[PDB]
C-alpha cells in the first residue's frame, strides 16, 4: 500500500502542478515593464543605538512607530525611544540564548524566547513601575524561533520542532497546534487582518495557515534551500520569502504560485531578513555580506543599498507609518535609516 499511496500523492502533485501551469498566462515581469523605475534610493543613517554587548538576534517596532524592543545574546532586552535614542527599560532574561522578540500591538507586553523552548511574556506597565514576567509558555520541544502577537491575550509562536502554535496567554495553555512542516520553522508573518498567517521552514517551503480553523490552507514551494525570513505584503494577498540560496521570492496567495524572483550574480549569501515598505513598492532584505539591499518589488531591479554594519545583519524592520527602517546585526549596533 505504501508505494500505492506514494503514487497517489505523486498524482495529486502532478494535478497541482498542471493546475498552476494553467493559470500562468503572463509573468509579473511582463506587466510592470511599462512602469517607471523608482530610481536610485540613498538612505542615510540617522541614529545608532548602542548598549548591547552580544550579537543582536531580534528587533521589533511598536505600533506607535516610536519605540523599539531589541534582544541580544547577553540575556537582555532593551526598549528604546528611537527619536531621542534614550533607553526606557533593560530587562534581564532568565537565559541568554534568546532568538526572537516581539512588541505587543497595545504596547503593554514584550515577548521573547529561544533555546530554552519557553516563551516569556513581560508586562511593561505595572503598578510598581517594575518590569515583571507575567507568563512563561512551555510545551514546545524545540528551540523557539519566532513570536508574534495577535492581541493582548493571544500569541502565535513557532519552534524548531516543525510545529507552530497559538497560545492563550492568560490561561497559559496552548490552544492550537499547526503541524505539517518537516524542517524547523524559521519565521512567521501575520496578515494585516490577523486571520491568516504564513510560516516558512527549513524545507524550502511556506504554508498559509488559517488562524481560526487550525487548518493549513496552502503550501508554497520554489526555494531550493532553507527559508530564513518571510513577510506579508501590505495588501495582504502576497508575501515575500528569503532563503539560503541567495534568492528572494514573491508569492501570491490567490494564484498559489511563485510570482517573482529577486537575485543577483554577485550575491551568494543567504537572506537573514525581509521587509516591505508602507506602499509595498520596495522590498528590503538583509544579507550575510553585512549589508541590506533595497529591491524594486514590482520590477526586481536593485534600488539601493544600506551599508554600515561590520558583521552579519540579523534583523530588519520598517515602521508602521513608514518614516524609518531599523536594522540590527551581530556587531551589537541597531541603526535607523530614513
Amino acid at each position: 500500500e505504501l508505494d500505492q499511496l506514494r503514487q497517489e500523492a505523486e498524482q495529486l502533485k502532478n494535478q497541482i502542478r498542471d493546475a498552476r501551469k494553467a493559470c500562468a498566462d503572463a509573468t509579473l515581469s511582463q506587466i510592470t515593464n511599462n512602469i517607471d523605475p523608482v530610481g536610485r534610493i540613498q538612505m542615510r543613517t540617522r541614529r545608532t543605538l548602542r548598549g548591547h554587548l552580544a550579537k543582536i538576534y531580534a528587533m521589533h517596532w511598536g505600533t506607535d512607530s516610536r519605540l523599539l524592543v531589541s534582544a541580544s545574546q547577553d540575556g537582555k532586552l532593551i526598549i528604546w525611544d528611537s527619536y531621542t535614542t534614550n533607553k526606557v527599560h533593560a530587562i534581564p532574561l532568565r537565559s541568554s540564548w534568546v532568538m526572537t522578540c516581539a512588541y505587543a500591538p497595545s504596547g503593554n507586553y514584550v515577548a521573547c524566547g529561544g533555546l530554552d523552548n519557553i516563551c516569556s511574556i513581560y508586562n511593561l506597565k505595572t503598578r510598581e513601575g517594575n518590569v515583571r514576567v507575567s507568563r512563561e509558555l512551555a510545551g514546545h520541544t524545540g528551540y523557539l524561533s519566532c513570536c508574534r502577537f495577535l492581541d493582548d491575550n493571544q500569541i502565535v509562536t513557532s519552534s524548531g520542532d516543525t510545529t507552530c502554535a497559538l497560545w492563550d496567554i492568560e490561561t497559559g495553555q496552548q490552544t492550537t497546534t499547526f503541524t505539517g512542516h518537516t524542517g524547523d520553522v524559521m519565521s512567521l508573518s501575520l496578515a494585516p487582518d490577523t486571520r491568516l498567517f504564513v510560516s516558512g521552514a527549513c524545507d524550502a517551503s511556506a504554508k498559509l495557515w488559517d488562524v481560526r480553523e487550525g487548518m493549513c490552507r496552502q503550501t508554497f514551494t520554489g526555494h531550493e534551500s532553507d527559508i530564513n525570513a518571510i513577510c506579508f505584503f501590505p495588501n495582504g494577498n502576497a508575501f515575500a520569502t528569503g532563503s539560503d540560496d541567495a534568492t528572494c521570492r514573491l508569492f501570491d496567495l490567490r494564484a498559489d504560485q511563485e510570482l517573482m524572483t529577486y537575485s543577483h550574480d554577485n550575491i551568494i549569501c543567504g537572506i537573514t531578513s525581509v521587509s516591505f515598505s508602507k506602499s509595498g513598492r520596495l522590498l528590503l532584505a538583509g544579507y550575510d555580506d553585512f549589508n541590506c539591499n533595497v529591491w524594486d518589488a514590482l520590477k526586481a531591479d536593485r534600488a539601493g543599498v544600506l551599508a554600515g554594519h561590520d558583521n552579519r545583519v540579523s534583523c530588519l524592520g520598517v515602521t508602521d507609518d513608514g518614516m524609518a527602517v531599523a536594522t540590527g546585526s551581530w556587531d551589537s549596533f541597531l541603526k535607523i535609516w530614513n
Binding site: 493559470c23 498566462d25 506587466i31 490567490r254
Partner: peptide, 8 residues
C-alpha cells in the same frame, strides 16, 4: 485559483 495576470 485566480489567473496570474489579474493578481499581478
Amino acid at each position: 485559483r485566480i489567473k496570474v495576470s489579474k493578481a499581478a
